[PDB]
Amino acid sequence: FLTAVSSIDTFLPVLNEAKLQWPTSALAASSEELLGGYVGSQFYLQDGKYMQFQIAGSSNRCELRQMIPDGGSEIGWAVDDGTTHTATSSIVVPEQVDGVEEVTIMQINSGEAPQLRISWIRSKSLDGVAYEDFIMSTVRIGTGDSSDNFVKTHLADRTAGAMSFQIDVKDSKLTITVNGNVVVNGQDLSFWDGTDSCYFKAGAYNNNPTSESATARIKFAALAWVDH
C-alpha cells in the first residue's frame, strides 16, 4: 500500500499549481487529480515526508509541470516580463542504480527549448575538470546542438542529506542557490527575451540511461513555485 503525496499538507500548494506527466510528456494527470489522491509507484509519499518520483527508460519522466493555480490552464511566462519567477526545493538524491546516467530534477522549459535543467550527473568533465556524482546546471544560450549553445556548471557534489535549491529569474537574468550558497549569479537569459511560454518543472526526467530498465529515483522534501 502506497501513501498519496496529497495525504499531508506539505506539497498541496505546489500540487494546486501543477500537472503530472508520467511516463512521457503527453500522458498527464491534472492538478485536480493530484489533489484528489493520485498515487502509484511512480509518485508516492516515502517515509511520511518525501514526494518521491521514479521512472525508467530513455527520456521517460515522472515530472510536475507548472500550471496556473486553482484549476488553471498551462502557465507561460517570460524571462523579461518584469516579474521574478522563483522555484524552491529541498531534494534528497539517493544513490542512483547502475544504468542511470543523468536525471533532470528541476527545469525551466518552454515551447522552444529548455532554458535551464538542473540534473544529477554520474560523471562528466567540465572546463577541464572531472566531476562525479554531482548536480549540474545546463543553460541554453542558443537553439543549436553543439556545446557552444550551452553553459554547464558544477553546482555541488551529491550529498547524503537534503539539498536546497532556489532558482530565480528576473529581468532576463538567472541566479541559482544551492544549500544557501550562490552557485550561479546573473547568468544571461536574454536570448529568450520575448519567449512567453516558459514554465517550471520538477521531478525525475531520465536522460541517456545505459539500461532501459534502470529506475531513476528522486525524493523531494519541499517544492514551491512563486511569482513576485
Ligand SMILES: O=C(O)[C@H]1O[C@@H](O[C@H]2[C@H](O)[C@H](O)[C@H](O[C@H]3[C@H](O)[C@H](O)[C@@H](O)O[C@@H]3C(=O)O)O[C@@H]2C(=O)O)[C@@H](O)[C@@H](O)[C@@H]1O
Ligand atoms: O559533452 C557534452 O557536454 C555532452 O553534451 C551532449 O549534448 C547534450 C546537450 O549538451 C544537452 O545536455 C542536451 O540536453 C537535452 C536533454 O538531455 C534532454 O533530452 C531535453 O531536456 O533536451 C535537452 C536539450 O536539447 O537542451 O542533451 C545532449 C545530449 O546528447 O545528451 C553531447 O554533445 C555529448 O558530446 C556530451 O554527452
